Amino acid sequence: MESADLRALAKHLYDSYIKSFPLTKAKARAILTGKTTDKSPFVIYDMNSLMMGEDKIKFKHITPSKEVAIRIFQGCQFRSVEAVQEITEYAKSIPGFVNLDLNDQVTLLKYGVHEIIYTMLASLMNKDGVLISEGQGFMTREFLKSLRKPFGDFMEPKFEFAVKFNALELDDSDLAIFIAVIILSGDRPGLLNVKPIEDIQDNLLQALELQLKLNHPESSQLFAKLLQKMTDLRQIVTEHVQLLQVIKKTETMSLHPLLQEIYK
Amino acid sequence: HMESADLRALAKHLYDSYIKSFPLTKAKARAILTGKTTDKSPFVIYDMNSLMMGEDKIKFKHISKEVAIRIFQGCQFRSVEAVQEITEYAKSIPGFVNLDLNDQVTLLKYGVHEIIYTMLASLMNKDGVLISEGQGFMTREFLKSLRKPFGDFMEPKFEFAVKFNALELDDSDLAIFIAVIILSGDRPGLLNVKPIEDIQDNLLQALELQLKLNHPESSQLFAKLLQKMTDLRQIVTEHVQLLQVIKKTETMSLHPLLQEIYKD
Ligand SMILES: O=C(O)c1ccc(-c2nn(C(=O)c3c(Cl)cccc3C(F)(F)F)c3ccc(Cl)cc23)c(OCCc2ccccc2)c1
Ligand SMILES: O=C(O)c1ccc(-c2nn(C(=O)c3c(Cl)cccc3C(F)(F)F)c3ccc(Cl)cc23)c(OCCc2ccccc2)c1
Secondary structure (H helix, E strand, O other), X not given: XXXXXXXXXXXXXXXXXXXXXXXXXXXXXXXXXXXXXOOOOEEEOOHHHHHHHHHHHXXXXXXXXXXXXXXXXXXXXXXHHHHHHHHHHHHOOOOOHHHOXXXXXXXXXXXXXHHHXXXXXXXXXXXXXXXXXXXXXXXXXXXXXXXXXXXXXXXXXXXXXXXXXXOOOOOHHXXXXXXXXXXXXXXXXOOOXXXXXXXXXXXXXXHHHHHHHHHOOOOOXXXXXXXXXXXXXXXXXXXXXXXXXXXXXXXXXXXXXXXXXXXX | OOOHHHHHHHHHHHHHHHHHHOOOOHHHHHHHHHOOOOOOOOEEEOOHHHHHHHHHHOOOOOOOOOHHHHHHHHHHHHHHHHHHHHHHXXXXXXXXXXXXXXXXXHHHHHHHHHHHHHHHHHOEEOOEEEEOOOOEEXXXXXXXXXOOOOHHHHHHHHHHHHHHHOOOOOHHHHHHHHHHHHOOOOOOOOOOHHHHHHHHHHHHXXXXXXXXXXXXXXXXXXXXXXXXXXXXHHHHHHHHHHHXXXXXXXXXOOOHHHHHHOOO
16 A cells, blocks of 8 residues: 555544544553643542542442442453454444454454453553543552452453553553554454454554554564464463453342343 | 664574573484484384383383373373473573563463474474484384374374475574564563564564575575464464363373473
8 A cells, every 4th residue: 555545544443443443542641640630539548538528529330239349350351351442443434444343353353352352441541540530530550459359360460551551651542553453353253254353453563663663663573572462362361361250250240131132 | 773783783693592591403303214224213112112112222211001191191291301401592582581571481482392393393204203302213104003092192293394494594594583483572461562463573584684685596585484373372272272172181281380381
């Protein structure tokens, strides 16, 4: 493709990225750094401030169970279900995606949303915590990591990944292409027609390659390093699923079957 | 960043070292597998009878035992030879022997297995694998049908090789790819990540140039090749988890070299 074509693809995905997701990376950076002297976020650092925070921000996943670590865990689910729809709608704007076989569209989203949620979560994290509720709350890493039994071990790898991933210093225009590449992976099991998916992903890769050289001209092999990250993501997604397994085996949680179906 | 003539020079140096370190190249393996030549023709092992003949015809460097064990011990003896050859090749990678000595050990520890699988693909097609420096050929069917846990042990190698070989890399490409794997600054416990990444950055530049010149019509071969370093990460873990099972069922001896590598 000609370079103006790639530049157009990049700006199309960036524009669509901005409209699809509730809090961009640029905004989240302004919050985490204190740069905006605007309203400081409500900080959740312990049990009492989690109580006060629910009552203040009036969270939408409230009145679920009772144990605090569980409540937090299930609010991670609530946000993930939301994220899934946000990525699904973003997908529709990747050139060519809607023209794929409907089953292949569903297969790509199904196996990809986990990796994308991990990635975008890093935009909302620093070494000390994570923005929640469109940047209005900030929940500390230490309070998450110190949750009881397995829940503490479940939250901390997200921060461990995010800190490493954020060292790349990608911005939203970088991430919008990167997200698209993940979605268009032709190696997802059960794809009926791999060829047009790789054809799209090749245009996306070309666009990401050129976007990274223009936007990070002094970051050698940033393209390569970012693809290596896409390696890890596969691994962390697998570790993650084997960790949701133990909780359902050991703790076994909610009862409302309808609720469980939404989170199926 | 380097000048192109310096990148071409590093590719030539690496290809020359690979030829000196690895006696059975992909080019020689492909000539044996394609045939159309009388002198290079392998004896084929597809069942117990041909295995028995096989040991009377081709010179196995691997001496009353049950057959799957006997084949297992054949691979591990050959894996140890491969570690030896890979170690010698690593030392030729510029900058490698100047790294901290425990980093050298750590990079080999986590890198040899990924390299063995990569170079095993050169010896394979969909129907089986070359053995004993190309003097023999053992069918995939025969390995797949071995008993207990040993049949399902041999088979994931073949599944990776068929996918990897679709890239159609030759030895000059593989020589630089093998090096990129070794100089991975993300291995657990590395003490000086930075000088390792500076070497890999150079190796990645060399691979990028090499793949564009040698495969000028292969869109995003670079990106696709880097995405294979993913699967590799997962088949290595699947391998060591299978080796874990066999230990608890078999008493099969592990070479001291391999015994130390498997250890965390
Ligand atoms: O806003 C956002 O874009 C956002 C996207 C994600 C999380 C998140 N997901 N998650 C997961 O385990 C997870 C992952 Cl990664 C991927 C797929 C599925 C799941 C899940 F859940 F289903 F298992 C986390 C684990 C730890 C942490 Cl710290 C965060 C997450 C997110 O956390 C906000 C959580 C929260 C808690 C209390 C109140 C309000 C919000 C925000
Ligand atoms: O020539 C070569 O470069 C070559 C490199 C590797 C194998 C190989 N290793 N291997 C392993 O299990 C293995 C791995 Cl990958 C890595 C570390 C440790 C081990 C092990 F053993 F300790 F557990 C295999 C499993 C299945 C298959 Cl098909 C091949 C391998 C290789 O096998 C064929 C050679 C052979 C020699 C004598 C008798 C029978 C076969 C050749």
